[PDB]
Short mmCIF file of C-alpha atoms in Angstrom, two decimals:
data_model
loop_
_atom_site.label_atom_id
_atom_site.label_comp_id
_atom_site.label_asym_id
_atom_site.label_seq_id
_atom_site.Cartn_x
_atom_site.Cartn_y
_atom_site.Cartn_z
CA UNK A 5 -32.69 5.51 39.52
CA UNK A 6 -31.63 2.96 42.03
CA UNK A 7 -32.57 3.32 45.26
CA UNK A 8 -29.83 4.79 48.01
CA UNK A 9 -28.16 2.73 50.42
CA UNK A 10 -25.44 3.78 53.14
CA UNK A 11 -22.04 2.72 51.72
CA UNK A 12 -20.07 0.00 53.65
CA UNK A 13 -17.10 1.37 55.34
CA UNK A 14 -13.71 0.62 54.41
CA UNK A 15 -11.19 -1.43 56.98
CA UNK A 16 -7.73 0.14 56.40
CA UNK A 17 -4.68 -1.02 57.57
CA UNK A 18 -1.44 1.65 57.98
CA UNK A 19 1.99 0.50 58.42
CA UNK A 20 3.97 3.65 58.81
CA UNK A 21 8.02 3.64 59.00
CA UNK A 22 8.88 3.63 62.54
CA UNK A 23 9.51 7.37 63.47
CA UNK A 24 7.69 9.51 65.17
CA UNK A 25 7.30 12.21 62.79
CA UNK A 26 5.77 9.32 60.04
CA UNK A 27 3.50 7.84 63.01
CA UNK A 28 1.45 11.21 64.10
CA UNK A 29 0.47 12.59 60.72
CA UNK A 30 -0.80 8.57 59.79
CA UNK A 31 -2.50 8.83 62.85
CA UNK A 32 -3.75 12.35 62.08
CA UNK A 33 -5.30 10.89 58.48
CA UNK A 34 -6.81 7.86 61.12
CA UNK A 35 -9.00 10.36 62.69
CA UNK A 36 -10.33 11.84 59.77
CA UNK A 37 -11.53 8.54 58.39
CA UNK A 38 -12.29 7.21 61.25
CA UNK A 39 -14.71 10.31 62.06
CA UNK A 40 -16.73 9.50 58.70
CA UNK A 41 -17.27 5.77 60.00
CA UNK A 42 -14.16 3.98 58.77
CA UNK A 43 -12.36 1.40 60.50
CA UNK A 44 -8.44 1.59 61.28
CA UNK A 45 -5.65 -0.49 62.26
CA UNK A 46 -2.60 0.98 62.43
CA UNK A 47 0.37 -1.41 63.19
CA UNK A 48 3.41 0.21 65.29
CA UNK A 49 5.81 -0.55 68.35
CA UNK A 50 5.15 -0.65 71.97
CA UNK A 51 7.04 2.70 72.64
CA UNK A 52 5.38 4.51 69.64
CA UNK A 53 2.20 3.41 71.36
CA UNK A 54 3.10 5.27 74.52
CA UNK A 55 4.26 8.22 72.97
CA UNK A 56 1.10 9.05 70.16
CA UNK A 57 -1.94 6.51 71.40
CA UNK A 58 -3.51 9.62 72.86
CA UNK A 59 -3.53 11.23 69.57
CA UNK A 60 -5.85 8.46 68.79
CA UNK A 61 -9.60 10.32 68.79
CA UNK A 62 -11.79 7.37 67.99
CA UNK A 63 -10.91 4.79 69.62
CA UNK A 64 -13.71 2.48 68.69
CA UNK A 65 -12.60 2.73 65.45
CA UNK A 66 -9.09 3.17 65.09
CA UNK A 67 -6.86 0.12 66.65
CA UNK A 68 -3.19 0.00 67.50
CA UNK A 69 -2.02 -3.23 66.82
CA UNK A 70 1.97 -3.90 68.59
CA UNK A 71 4.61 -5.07 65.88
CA UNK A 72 8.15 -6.14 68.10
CA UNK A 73 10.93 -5.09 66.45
CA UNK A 74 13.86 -7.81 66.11
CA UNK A 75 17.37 -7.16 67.59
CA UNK A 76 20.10 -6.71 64.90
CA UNK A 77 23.58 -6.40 63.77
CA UNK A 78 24.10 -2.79 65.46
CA UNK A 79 21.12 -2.08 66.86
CA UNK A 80 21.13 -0.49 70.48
CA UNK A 81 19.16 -2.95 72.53
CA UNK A 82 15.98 -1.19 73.36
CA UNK A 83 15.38 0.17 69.65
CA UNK A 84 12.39 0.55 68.02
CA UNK A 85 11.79 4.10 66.60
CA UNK A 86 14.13 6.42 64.95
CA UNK A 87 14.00 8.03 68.23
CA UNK A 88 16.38 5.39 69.90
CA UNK A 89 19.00 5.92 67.04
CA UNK A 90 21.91 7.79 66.16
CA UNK A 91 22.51 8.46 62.47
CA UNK A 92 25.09 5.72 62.26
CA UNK A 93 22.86 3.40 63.25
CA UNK A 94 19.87 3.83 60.31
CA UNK A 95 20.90 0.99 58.87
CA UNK A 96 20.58 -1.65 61.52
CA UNK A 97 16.79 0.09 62.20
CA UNK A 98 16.30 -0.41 58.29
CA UNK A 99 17.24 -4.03 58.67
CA UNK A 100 15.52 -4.49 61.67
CA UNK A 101 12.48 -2.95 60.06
CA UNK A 102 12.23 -4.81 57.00
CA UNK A 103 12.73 -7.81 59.62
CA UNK A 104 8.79 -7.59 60.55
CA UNK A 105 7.71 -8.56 57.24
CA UNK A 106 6.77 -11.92 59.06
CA UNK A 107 5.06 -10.13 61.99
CA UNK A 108 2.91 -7.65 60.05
CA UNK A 109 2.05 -10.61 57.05
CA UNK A 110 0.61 -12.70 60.33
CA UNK A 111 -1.38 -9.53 61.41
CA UNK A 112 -2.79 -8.30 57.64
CA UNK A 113 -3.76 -12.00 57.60
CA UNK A 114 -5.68 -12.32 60.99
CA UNK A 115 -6.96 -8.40 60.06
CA UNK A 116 -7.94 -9.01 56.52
CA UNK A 117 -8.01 -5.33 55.70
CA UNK A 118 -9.19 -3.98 52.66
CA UNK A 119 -6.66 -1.15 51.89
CA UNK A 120 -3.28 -1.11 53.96
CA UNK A 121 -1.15 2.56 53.68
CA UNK A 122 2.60 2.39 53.74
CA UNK A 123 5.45 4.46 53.01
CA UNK A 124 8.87 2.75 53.20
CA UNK A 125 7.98 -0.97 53.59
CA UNK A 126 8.49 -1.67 49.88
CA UNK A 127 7.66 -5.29 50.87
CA UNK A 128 4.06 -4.65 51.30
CA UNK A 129 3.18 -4.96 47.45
CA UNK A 130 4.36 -8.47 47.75
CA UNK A 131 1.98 -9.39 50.72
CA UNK A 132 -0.60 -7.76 48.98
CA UNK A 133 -0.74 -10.42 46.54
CA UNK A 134 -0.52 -13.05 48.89
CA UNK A 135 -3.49 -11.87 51.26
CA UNK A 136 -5.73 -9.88 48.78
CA UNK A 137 -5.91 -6.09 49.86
CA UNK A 138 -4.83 -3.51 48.00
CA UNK A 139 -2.50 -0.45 48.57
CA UNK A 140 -1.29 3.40 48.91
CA UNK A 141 1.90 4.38 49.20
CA UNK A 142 1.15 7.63 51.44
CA UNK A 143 3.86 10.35 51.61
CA UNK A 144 3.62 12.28 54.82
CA UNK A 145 5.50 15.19 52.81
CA UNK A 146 5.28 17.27 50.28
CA UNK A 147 5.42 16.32 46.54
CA UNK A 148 8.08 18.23 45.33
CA UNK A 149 10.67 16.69 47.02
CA UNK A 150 9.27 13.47 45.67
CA UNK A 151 9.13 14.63 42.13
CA UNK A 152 12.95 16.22 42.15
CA UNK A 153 14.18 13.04 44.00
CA UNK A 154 13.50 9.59 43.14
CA UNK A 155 12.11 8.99 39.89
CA UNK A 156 12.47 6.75 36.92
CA UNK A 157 13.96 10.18 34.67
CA UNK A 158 16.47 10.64 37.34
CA UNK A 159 19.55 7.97 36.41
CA UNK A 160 21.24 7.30 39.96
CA UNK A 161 24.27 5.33 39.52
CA UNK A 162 24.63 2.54 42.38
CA UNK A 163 28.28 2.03 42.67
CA UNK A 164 29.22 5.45 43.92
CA UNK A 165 27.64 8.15 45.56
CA UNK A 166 25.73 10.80 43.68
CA UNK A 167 27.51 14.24 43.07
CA UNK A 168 26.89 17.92 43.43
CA UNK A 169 25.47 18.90 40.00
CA UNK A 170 24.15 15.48 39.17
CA UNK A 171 21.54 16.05 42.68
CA UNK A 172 20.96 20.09 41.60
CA UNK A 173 20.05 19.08 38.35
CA UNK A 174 16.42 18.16 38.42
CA UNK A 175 15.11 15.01 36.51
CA UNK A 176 14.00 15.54 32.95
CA UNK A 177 10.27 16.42 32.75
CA UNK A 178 10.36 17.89 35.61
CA UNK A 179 7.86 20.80 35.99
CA UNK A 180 9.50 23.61 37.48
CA UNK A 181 12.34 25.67 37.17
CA UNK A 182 11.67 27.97 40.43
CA UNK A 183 10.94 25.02 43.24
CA UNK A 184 14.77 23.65 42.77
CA UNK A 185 18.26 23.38 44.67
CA UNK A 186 20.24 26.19 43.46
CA UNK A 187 23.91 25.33 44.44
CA UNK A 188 25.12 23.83 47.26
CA UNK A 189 21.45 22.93 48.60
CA UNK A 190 21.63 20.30 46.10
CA UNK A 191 23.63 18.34 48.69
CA UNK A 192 20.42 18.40 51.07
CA UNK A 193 18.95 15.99 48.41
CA UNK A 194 22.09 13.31 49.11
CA UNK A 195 20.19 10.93 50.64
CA UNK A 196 18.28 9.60 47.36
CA UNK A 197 21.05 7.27 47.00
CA UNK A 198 22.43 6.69 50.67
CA UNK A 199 22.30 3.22 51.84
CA UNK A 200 19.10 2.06 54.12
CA UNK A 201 19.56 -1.45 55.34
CA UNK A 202 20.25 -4.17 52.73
CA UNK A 203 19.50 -1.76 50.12
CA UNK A 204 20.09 1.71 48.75
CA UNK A 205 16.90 4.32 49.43
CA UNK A 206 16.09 4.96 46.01
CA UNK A 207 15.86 1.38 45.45
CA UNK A 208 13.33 0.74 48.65
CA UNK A 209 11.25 3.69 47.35
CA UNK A 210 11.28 2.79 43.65
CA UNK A 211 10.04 -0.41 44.87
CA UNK A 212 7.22 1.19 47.28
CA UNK A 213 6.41 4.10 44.30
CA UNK A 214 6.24 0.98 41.40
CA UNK A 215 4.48 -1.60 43.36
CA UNK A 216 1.42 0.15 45.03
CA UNK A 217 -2.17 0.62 43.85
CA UNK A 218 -2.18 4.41 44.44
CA UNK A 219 0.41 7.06 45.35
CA UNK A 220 -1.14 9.15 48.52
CA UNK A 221 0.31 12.39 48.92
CA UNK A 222 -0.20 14.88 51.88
CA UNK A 223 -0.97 18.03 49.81
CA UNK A 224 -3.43 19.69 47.20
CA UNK A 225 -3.42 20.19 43.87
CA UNK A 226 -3.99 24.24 44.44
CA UNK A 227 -0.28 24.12 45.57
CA UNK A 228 1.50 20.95 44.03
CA UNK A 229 -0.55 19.67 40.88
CA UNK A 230 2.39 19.55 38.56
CA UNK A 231 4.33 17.89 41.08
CA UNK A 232 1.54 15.19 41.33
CA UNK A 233 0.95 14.86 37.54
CA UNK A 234 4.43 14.54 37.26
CA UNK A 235 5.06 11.45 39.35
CA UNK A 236 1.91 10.29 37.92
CA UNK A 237 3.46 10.18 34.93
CA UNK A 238 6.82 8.89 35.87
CA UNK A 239 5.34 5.34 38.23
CA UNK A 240 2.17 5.26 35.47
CA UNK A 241 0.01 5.54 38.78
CA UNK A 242 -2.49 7.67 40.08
CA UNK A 243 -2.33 10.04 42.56
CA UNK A 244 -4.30 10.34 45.37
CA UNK A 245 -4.25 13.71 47.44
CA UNK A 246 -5.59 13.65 51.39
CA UNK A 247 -4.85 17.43 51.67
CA UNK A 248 -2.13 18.56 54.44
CA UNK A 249 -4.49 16.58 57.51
CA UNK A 250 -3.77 18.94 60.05
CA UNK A 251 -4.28 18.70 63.33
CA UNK A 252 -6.97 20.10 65.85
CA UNK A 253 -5.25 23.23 66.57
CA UNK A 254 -5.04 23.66 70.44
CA UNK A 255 -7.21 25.68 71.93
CA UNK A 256 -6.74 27.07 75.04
CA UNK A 257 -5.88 30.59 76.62
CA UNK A 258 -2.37 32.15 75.98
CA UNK A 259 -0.03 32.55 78.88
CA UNK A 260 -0.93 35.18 81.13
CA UNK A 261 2.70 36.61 80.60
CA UNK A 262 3.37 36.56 76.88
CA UNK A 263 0.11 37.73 76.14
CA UNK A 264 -0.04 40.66 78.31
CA UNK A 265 3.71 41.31 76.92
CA UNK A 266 2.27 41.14 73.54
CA UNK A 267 -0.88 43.10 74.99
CA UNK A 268 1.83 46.04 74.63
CA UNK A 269 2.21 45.99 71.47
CA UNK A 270 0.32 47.93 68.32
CA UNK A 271 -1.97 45.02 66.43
CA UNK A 272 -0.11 43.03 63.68
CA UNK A 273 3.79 44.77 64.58
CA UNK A 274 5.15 41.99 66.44
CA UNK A 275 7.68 39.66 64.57
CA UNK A 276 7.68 35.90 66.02
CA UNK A 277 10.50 33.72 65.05
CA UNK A 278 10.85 29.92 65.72
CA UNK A 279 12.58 26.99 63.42
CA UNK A 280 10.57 23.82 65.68
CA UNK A 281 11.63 21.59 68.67
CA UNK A 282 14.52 19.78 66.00
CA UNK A 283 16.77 21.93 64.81
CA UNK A 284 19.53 23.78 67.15
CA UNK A 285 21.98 26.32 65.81
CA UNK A 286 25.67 27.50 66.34
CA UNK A 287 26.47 30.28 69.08
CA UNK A 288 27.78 32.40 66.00
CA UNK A 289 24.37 31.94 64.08
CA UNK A 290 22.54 32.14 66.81
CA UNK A 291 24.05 35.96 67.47
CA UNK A 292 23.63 37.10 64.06
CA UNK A 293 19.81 36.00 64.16
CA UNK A 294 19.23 38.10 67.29
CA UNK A 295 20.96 41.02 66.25
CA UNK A 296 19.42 40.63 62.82
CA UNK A 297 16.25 41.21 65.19
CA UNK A 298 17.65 44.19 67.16
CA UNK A 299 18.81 45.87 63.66
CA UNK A 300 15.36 45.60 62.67
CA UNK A 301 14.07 48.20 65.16
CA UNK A 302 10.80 46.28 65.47
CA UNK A 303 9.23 44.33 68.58
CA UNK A 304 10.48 40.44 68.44
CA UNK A 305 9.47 37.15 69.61
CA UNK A 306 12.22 34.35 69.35
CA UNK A 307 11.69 30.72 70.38
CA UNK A 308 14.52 28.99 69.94
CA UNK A 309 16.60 26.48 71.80
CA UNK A 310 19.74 27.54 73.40
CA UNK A 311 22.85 26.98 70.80
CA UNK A 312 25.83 24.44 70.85
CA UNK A 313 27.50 25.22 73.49
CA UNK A 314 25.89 28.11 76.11
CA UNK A 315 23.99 27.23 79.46
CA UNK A 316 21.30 28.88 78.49
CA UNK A 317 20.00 31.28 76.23
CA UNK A 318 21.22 34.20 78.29
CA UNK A 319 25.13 33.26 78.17
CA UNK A 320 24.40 33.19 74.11
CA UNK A 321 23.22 36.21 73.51
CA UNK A 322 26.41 38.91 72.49
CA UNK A 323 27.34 41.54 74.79
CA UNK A 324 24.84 44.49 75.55
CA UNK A 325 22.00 42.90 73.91
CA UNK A 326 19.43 42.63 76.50
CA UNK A 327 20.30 46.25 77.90
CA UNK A 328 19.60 47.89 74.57
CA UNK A 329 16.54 45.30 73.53
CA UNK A 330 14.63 45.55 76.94
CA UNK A 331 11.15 46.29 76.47
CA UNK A 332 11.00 45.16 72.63
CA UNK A 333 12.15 41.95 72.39
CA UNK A 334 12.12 38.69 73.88
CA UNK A 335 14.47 35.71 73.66
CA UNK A 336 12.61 32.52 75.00
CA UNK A 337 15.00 28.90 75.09
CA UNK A 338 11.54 26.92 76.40
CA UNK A 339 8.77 25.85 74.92
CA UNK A 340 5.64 28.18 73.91
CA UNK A 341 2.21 28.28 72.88
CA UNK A 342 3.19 28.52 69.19
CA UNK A 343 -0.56 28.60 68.02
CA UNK A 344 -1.54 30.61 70.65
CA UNK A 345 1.35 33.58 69.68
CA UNK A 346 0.31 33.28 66.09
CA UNK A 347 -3.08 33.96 66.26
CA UNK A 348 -2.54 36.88 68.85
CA UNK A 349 -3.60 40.35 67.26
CA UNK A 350 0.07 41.70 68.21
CA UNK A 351 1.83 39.51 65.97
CA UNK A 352 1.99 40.43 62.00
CA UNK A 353 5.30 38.18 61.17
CA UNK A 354 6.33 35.13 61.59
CA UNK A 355 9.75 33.58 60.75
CA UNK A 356 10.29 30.28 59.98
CA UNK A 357 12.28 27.32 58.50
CA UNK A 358 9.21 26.02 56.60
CA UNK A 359 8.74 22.68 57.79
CA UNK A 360 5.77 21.01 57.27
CA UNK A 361 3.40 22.42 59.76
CA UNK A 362 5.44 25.57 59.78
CA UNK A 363 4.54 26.31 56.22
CA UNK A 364 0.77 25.32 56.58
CA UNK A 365 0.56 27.63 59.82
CA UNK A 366 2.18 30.56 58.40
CA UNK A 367 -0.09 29.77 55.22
CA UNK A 368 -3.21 29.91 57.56
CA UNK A 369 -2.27 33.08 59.66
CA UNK A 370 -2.61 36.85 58.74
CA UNK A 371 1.17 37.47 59.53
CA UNK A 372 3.63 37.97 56.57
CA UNK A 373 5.84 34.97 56.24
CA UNK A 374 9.91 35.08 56.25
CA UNK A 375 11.78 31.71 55.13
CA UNK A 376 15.24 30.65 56.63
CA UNK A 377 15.23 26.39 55.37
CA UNK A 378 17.57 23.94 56.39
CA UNK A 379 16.77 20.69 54.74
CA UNK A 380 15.60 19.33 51.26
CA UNK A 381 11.97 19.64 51.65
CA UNK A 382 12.26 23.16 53.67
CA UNK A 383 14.10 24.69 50.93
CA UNK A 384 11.44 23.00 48.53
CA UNK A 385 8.45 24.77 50.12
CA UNK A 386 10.02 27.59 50.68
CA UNK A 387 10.63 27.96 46.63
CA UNK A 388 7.45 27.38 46.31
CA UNK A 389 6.20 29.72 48.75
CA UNK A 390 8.56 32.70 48.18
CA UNK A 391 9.55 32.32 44.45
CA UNK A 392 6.70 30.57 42.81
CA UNK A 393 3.77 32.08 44.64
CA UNK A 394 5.09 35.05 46.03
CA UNK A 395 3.46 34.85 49.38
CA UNK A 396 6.43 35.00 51.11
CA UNK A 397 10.09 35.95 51.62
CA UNK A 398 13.21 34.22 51.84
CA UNK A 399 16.44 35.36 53.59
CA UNK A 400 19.54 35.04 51.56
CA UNK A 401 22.08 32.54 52.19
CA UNK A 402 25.74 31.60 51.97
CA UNK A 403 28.34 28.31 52.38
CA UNK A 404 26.48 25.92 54.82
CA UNK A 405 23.59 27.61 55.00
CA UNK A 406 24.75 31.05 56.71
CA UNK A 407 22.53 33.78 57.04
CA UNK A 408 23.38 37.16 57.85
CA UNK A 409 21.64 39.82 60.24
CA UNK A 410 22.06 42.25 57.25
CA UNK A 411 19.78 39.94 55.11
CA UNK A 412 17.50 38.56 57.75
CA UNK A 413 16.68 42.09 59.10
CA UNK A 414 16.50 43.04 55.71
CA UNK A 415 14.08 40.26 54.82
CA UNK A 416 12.17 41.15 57.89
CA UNK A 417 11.64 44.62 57.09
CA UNK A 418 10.79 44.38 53.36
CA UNK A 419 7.60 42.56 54.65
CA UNK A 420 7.03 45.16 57.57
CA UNK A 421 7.67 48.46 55.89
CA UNK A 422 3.81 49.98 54.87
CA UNK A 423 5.46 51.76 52.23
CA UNK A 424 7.56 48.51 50.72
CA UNK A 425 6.22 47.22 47.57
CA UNK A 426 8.14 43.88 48.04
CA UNK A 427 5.69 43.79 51.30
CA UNK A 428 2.65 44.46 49.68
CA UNK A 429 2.71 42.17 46.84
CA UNK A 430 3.68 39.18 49.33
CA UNK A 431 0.59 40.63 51.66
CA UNK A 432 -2.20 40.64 48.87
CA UNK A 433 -1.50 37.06 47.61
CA UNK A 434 -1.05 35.44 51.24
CA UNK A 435 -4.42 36.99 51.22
CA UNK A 436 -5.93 35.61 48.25
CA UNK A 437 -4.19 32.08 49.05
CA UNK A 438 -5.53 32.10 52.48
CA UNK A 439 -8.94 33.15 51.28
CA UNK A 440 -8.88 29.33 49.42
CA UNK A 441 -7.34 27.30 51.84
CA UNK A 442 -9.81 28.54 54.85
CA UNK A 443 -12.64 28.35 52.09
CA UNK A 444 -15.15 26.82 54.16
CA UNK A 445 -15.04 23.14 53.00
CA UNK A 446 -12.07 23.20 51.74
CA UNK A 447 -10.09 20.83 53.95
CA UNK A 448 -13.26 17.81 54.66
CA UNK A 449 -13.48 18.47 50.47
CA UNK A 450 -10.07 16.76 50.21
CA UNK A 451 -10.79 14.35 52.63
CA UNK A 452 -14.20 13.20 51.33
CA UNK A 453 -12.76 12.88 47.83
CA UNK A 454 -9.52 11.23 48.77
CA UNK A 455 -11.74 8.39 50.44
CA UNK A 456 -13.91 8.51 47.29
CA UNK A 457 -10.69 7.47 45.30
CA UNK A 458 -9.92 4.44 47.98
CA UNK A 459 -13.32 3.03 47.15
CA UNK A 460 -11.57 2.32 43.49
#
């Protein structure tokens, strides 16, 4: 034997593209290595800072180190995040961002990390070899969308853009033929050959795929281990999985109003509905959801934001529909204790669009789980979720992503109905998969072996 010793912590280094939405889950992983002794510094700008530092939970380990982003060609002149940009402006905030190369090589330099995590700074590699650390490339998604998109097998032509069968068609190898585009989703998926600054994306992430030490992926293998063998397979790299890295989930007490509201209600028969704080819909949408609600006949909790064009969500909603919903249904344009709802006794559905947290919450919860998707990696999960492992449902669509109340209250009820077969097949496995993922262990497990894999 030789004797034990207390392994030397790791000093990682995380430079995240600048959005928001990359920031907080890097942040998130922070706080899980920092909590077993590790040392962080994550590089980000000044407004960034103000916005996420107090996600920050260990603060003696974990350091926030300001990176100034240059002014452009086209760049408003605050601009730092993705959240000071309009979509015709990605490219000067590309530009701009590959413009700190100087700034960040300075800091690695001074900070002499061991490790440094990136995502679209395909630049990094080339630093690495300069200074001496060594790297992940750490996806704050999903792996499917990763596997389907950019990849060697997948030829994408850089003259012209890519077309509608060329994106639905997944490349060769790949290892499913349920967790795919079917139709006109495919054009959700355009962006793999968009332009993003001086260079086309799938050129930038080629790059960052190809030149890092390890891919990191924000999943498990219980869920996505084809997907990860797959682009294993297709960089010749290995993969390293963190697990999703959720966040605390907030505790404190529900409302006083919505939970006496849902206090009304018989356990597990109220349906809660809410696509996150992003996405906004049409008035016309927006009335077939509700109605798709009323035509369901049960109790109803919607949280969404008002639609293009009303005051509020009062002037949205069609004609007679508050009369004839009174007691049973709400229709709430604010924000709400999502977690809180959830986990109330009352509530036994929950409809969703299947982001990221969306999916891992519904996942989590003792409700049955209705999909409505928008974008590439929505539909993605939601495949997996209600094709591949059946724990789920997912409302019908049409041209630019239309659903109808028919379908949706259709949906709704073949997961509500005690008698509906549909319901209890999607019931028992949410069951079974829950009974894994809440497996005590099960979460720290991934952690624990994900920094096992960083020590090589």
């Amino acid at each position: 034997r030789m004797p034990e010793f207390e392994k030397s912590k790791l000093h990682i280094a995380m430079y995240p593209w600048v959005a928001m939405g990359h920031i907080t889950p890097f942040i998130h992983l922070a706080n899980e290595l920092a909590k077993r002794g590790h040392s962080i510094s994550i590089l980000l700008p000044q407004k960034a800072l103000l916005q996420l530092g107090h996600n920050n939970l260990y603060p003696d380990l974990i350091k926030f180190h300001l990176v100034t982003v240059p002014q452009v060609d086209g760049l408003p002149p605050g601009a730092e995040t993705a959240s000071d940009i309009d979509i015709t402006a990605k490219n000067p905030l590309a530009i701009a961002f590959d413009a700190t190369s100087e700034q960040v090589e300075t800091l690695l330099h001074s900070l002499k990390p061991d490790i440094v995590f990136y995502d679209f700074a395909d630049w990094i590699p080339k630093l690495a070899a300069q200074i001496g650390f060594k790297t992940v490339c750490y996806n704050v998604i999903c792996a499917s969308v990763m596997a389907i998109g950019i990849v060697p097998a997948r030829h994408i032509p850089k003259d012209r853009p890519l077309t509608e069968q060329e994106l639905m068609e997944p490349p060769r190898g790949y290892p499913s033929s349920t967790v795919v585009l079917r139709g006109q989703e495919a054009l959700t998926l355009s962006f793999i050959g968009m332009d993003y600054g001086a260079t086309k994306f799938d050129v930038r992430i080629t790059a960052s795929m190809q030149g890092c030490d390890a891919i990191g992926i924000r999943t498990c293998r219980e869920l996505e281990g084809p997907m990860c063998d797959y682009l294993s397979a297709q960089y010749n790299k290995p993969v390293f999985l963190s697990g999703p890295v959720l966040p605390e989930t907030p505790k404190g007490p529900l409302e006083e109003k919505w939970d006496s509201w849902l206090n009304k209600f018989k356990p597990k028969s109220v349906v809660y509905c809410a696509f996150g704080s992003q996405m906004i819909l049409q008035k016309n949408q927006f009335q077939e959801l509700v109605l798709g609600f009323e035509m369901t006949g049960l109790p109803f909790f919607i949280a969404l934001s008002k639609p293009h064009g009303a005051d509020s969500v009062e002037e949205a909603l069609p004609d007679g529909f508050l009369e004839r919903v009174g007691d049973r249904g709400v229709v709430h344009g604010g924000w709400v204790q999502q977690t809180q709802i959830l986990n109330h006794p009352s509530v036994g559905c929950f409809v969703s669009h299947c982001g990221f947290g969306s999916m891992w919450e519904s996942l989590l919860s003792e409700s049955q789980i209705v999909l409505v998707p928008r974008l590439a990696d929505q539909i993605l999960n939601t495949r997996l979720l209600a094709e591949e492992l059946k724990v789920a449902v997912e409302v019908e669509r049409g041209d630019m992503g239309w659903f109808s109340k028919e379908d949706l209250s259709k949906a709704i009820k073949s997961v509500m109905d005690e008698d509906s077969e549909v319901g209890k097949l999607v019931k028992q496995n949410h069951a079974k998969w829950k009974e894994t993922l809440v497996s005590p262990g099960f979460m720290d497990n991934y952690i624990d072996n994900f920094i096992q894999q960083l020590y090589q």
